[PDB]
Amino acid sequence: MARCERLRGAALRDVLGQAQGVLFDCDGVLWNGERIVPGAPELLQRLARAGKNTLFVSNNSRRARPELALRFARLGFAGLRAEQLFSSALCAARLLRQRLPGPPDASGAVFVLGGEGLRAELRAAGLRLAGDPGEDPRVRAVLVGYDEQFSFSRLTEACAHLRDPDCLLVATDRDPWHPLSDGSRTPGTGSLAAAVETASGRQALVVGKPSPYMFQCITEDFSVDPARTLMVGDRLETDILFGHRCGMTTVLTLTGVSSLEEAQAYLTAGQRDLVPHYYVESIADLMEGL
Amino acid sequence: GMARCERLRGAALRDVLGQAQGVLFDCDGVLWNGERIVPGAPELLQRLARAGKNTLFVSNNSRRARPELALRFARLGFAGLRAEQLFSSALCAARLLRQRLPGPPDASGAVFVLGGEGLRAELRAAGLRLAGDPGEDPRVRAVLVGYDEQFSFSRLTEACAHLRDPDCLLVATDRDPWHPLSDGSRTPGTGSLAAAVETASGRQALVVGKPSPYMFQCITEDFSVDPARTLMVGDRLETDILFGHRCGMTTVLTLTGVSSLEEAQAYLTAGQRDLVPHYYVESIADLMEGLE
Ligand code: BEF
Ligand code: BEF
Ligand SMILES: [Mg+2]
Ligand SMILES: [Mg+2]
């Protein structure tokens, strides 16, 4: 039962040694916008050298796997394999492929409220998109992602497809909003998903943290022992909650969305699923254990 | 009076109407569907007036300011109504905001509005200054979410920016989630936009329209209404009927609109008593057989 203590000194050396791997959230953890978190690449390198597995799990649905891989390299994280990178975009594509196969054939298409990266992730899995060239097949699912082209007419069209009860509704994540480097905020997929759900009268299947699905998607590709895995993230209600649900050890870093006091407030309120085991000022602080 | 969803006809209809001082009518799906009146609706209103029963009208429709809504009634054949009898969520939003945003002269700021020109006009008639109107946009002191056919990701973003300030109010006209169109398709309702704005801003909106009691308050500032002796007549269980229950009125579901008898009956069998109408009719025309 999580106590939100500062991970330093001996405990930190013990926690890292016991670890098989570290699951890292990306935004607010490795970088903020185009500014990397100092020590972050050096941390990853030392982790690898110490033979501790690293994986990356992000609710960001803007970047397909190849562009996310480029971003890591560009910002200075070398030696990563694309296979280590999980976004809600990737896992939505895999969930939709799973739900849409069958003994039946001639499936259908996905209507996507989202950007080019999310679309590209679905095409890479072999799904067809409403609005691509050629045949208009039956729309069999609506996917809601981070959609800067969101509009009333696109909301209306989503709901029309959802009048068919067999048409699925999937959302990449419910993150409600995100910080920008200028201090302003941008609405998150959760706000778009809420509009689509309310207008269509449906409940969405949510793929991203804190949904366990994000973890299944990962364990299909790697063996992960939740007991010996650290889940590291900056957001209490997505990363920490996810970590608790998966039975992992949880580390809040303070470089991102949540504050140490928000965590303490959950603790005093006895909401244990939202309380991290440990916190650090920065993921750079983890290095003193290697 | 625990609702049993009974068909209002015969003696029950004569009794209920006889005890009533007045009838509150929801408008869409009740007096009309689109540009098509419900047959008998104009005659009903006339006969109600002759019988000395007061009528008032509530709508969650935020598209027409009160003058145009009044012109609509007249054009479709409803005679004898005065504009002051018409309460829309637009009107009541303008009043809530006028109440909450008066203060010293210099304090007065602006309302950032997600909605159409009807709603805009309703707020200006109440003396409110609007972001996006000509000249200086003063401090935004409230965000209003209404039915917004021009809703967009950037305007959602701009609303949230205003809402970062905890003292900026968030008001929604209503939470109706979607509405039927004449071709059988649907348009998203304010409730869906409001949900997006509330989620992205981390705020709870003050809701003005039915089933919020605020709409009833907005009405009782202008007219004496005894809820015990008033019928609330509507086509939507989750908005009109619930509203009637919260205000302590006898509730009548009419079937010419959004909800079905079977939806009402399922609420009954589930014990969701606040979503069960006391009575129902196929059409509000049926009410006429209870008047002499
Ligand atoms: F990249 Be994480 F979801 F902030
Ligand atoms: F006019 Be009601 F709000 F349908
Ligand atoms: Mg993050
Ligand atoms: Mg109605």
Swiss-Prot record, chain A:
<dbReference type="GO" id="GO:0031247">
    <property type="term" value="P:actin rod assembly"/>
</dbReference>
<dbReference type="GO" id="GO:0042803">
    <property type="term" value="F:protein homodimerization activity"/>
</dbReference>
<dbReference type="GO" id="GO:0007088">
    <property type="term" value="P:regulation of mitotic nuclear division"/>
</dbReference>
<dbReference type="InterPro" id="IPR036412">
    <property type="entry name" value="HAD-like_sf"/>
</dbReference>
<feature type="binding site">
    <location>
        <position position="178"/>
    </location>
    <ligand>
        <name>substrate</name>
    </ligand>
</feature>
<dbReference type="GO" id="GO:0031072">
    <property type="term" value="F:heat shock protein binding"/>
</dbReference>
<dbReference type="Pfam" id="PF13344">
    <property type="entry name" value="Hydrolase_6"/>
</dbReference>
<feature type="binding site">
    <location>
        <begin position="58"/>
        <end position="60"/>
    </location>
    <ligand>
        <name>substrate</name>
    </ligand>
</feature>
<dbReference type="InterPro" id="IPR006349">
    <property type="entry name" value="PGP_euk"/>
</dbReference>
<dbReference type="GO" id="GO:0004721">
    <property type="term" value="F:phosphoprotein phosphatase activity"/>
</dbReference>
<dbReference type="GO" id="GO:0032154">
    <property type="term" value="C:cleavage furrow"/>
</dbReference>
<dbReference type="GO" id="GO:0032361">
    <property type="term" value="P:pyridoxal phosphate catabolic process"/>
</dbReference>
<dbReference type="GO" id="GO:0030496">
    <property type="term" value="C:midbody"/>
</dbReference>
<protein>
    <recommendedName>
        <fullName>Chronophin</fullName>
        <ecNumber>3.1.3.16</ecNumber>
        <ecNumber>3.1.3.74</ecNumber>
    </recommendedName>
</protein>
<dbReference type="InterPro" id="IPR006357">
    <property type="entry name" value="HAD-SF_hydro_IIA"/>
</dbReference>
<dbReference type="GO" id="GO:0098794">
    <property type="term" value="C:postsynapse"/>
</dbReference>
<dbReference type="GO" id="GO:0098978">
    <property type="term" value="C:glutamatergic synapse"/>
</dbReference>
<keyword id="KW-0378">Hydrolase</keyword>
<dbReference type="GO" id="GO:0032587">
    <property type="term" value="C:ruffle membrane"/>
</dbReference>
<feature type="binding site">
    <location>
        <position position="25"/>
    </location>
    <ligand>
        <name>Mg(2+)</name>
    </ligand>
</feature>
<dbReference type="GO" id="GO:0005829">
    <property type="term" value="C:cytosol"/>
</dbReference>
<keyword id="KW-0472">Membrane</keyword>
<feature type="binding site">
    <location>
        <position position="27"/>
    </location>
    <ligand>
        <name>Mg(2+)</name>
    </ligand>
</feature>
<dbReference type="GO" id="GO:0015629">
    <property type="term" value="C:actin cytoskeleton"/>
</dbReference>
<dbReference type="GO" id="GO:0004722">
    <property type="term" value="F:protein serine/threonine phosphatase activity"/>
</dbReference>
<dbReference type="InterPro" id="IPR023214">
    <property type="entry name" value="HAD_sf"/>
</dbReference>
<dbReference type="GO" id="GO:0006470">
    <property type="term" value="P:protein dephosphorylation"/>
</dbReference>
<comment type="subunit">
    <text>Homodimer.</text>
</comment>
<keyword id="KW-0479">Metal-binding</keyword>
<keyword id="KW-0460">Magnesium</keyword>
<dbReference type="GO" id="GO:0030836">
    <property type="term" value="P:positive regulation of actin filament depolymerization"/>
</dbReference>
<dbReference type="GO" id="GO:0005911">
    <property type="term" value="C:cell-cell junction"/>
</dbReference>
<dbReference type="GO" id="GO:0033883">
    <property type="term" value="F:pyridoxal phosphatase activity"/>
</dbReference>
<comment type="similarity">
    <text>Belongs to the HAD-like hydrolase superfamily.</text>
</comment>
<comment type="function">
    <text>Functions as a pyridoxal phosphate (PLP) phosphatase, which also catalyzes the dephosphorylation of pyridoxine 5'-phosphate (PNP) and pyridoxamine 5'-phosphate (PMP), with order of substrate preference PLP &gt; PNP &gt; PMP and therefore plays a role in vitamin B6 metabolism. Also functions as a protein serine phosphatase that specifically dephosphorylates 'Ser-3' in proteins of the actin-depolymerizing factor (ADF)/cofilin family like CFL1 and DSTN. Thereby, regulates cofilin-dependent actin cytoskeleton reorganization, being required for normal progress through mitosis and normal cytokinesis.</text>
</comment>
<dbReference type="GO" id="GO:0071318">
    <property type="term" value="P:cellular response to ATP"/>
</dbReference>
<keyword id="KW-1003">Cell membrane</keyword>
<feature type="binding site">
    <location>
        <position position="209"/>
    </location>
    <ligand>
        <name>substrate</name>
    </ligand>
</feature>
<keyword id="KW-0966">Cell projection</keyword>
<dbReference type="Pfam" id="PF13242">
    <property type="entry name" value="Hydrolase_like"/>
</dbReference>
<keyword id="KW-0963">Cytoplasm</keyword>
<keyword id="KW-0663">Pyridoxal phosphate</keyword>
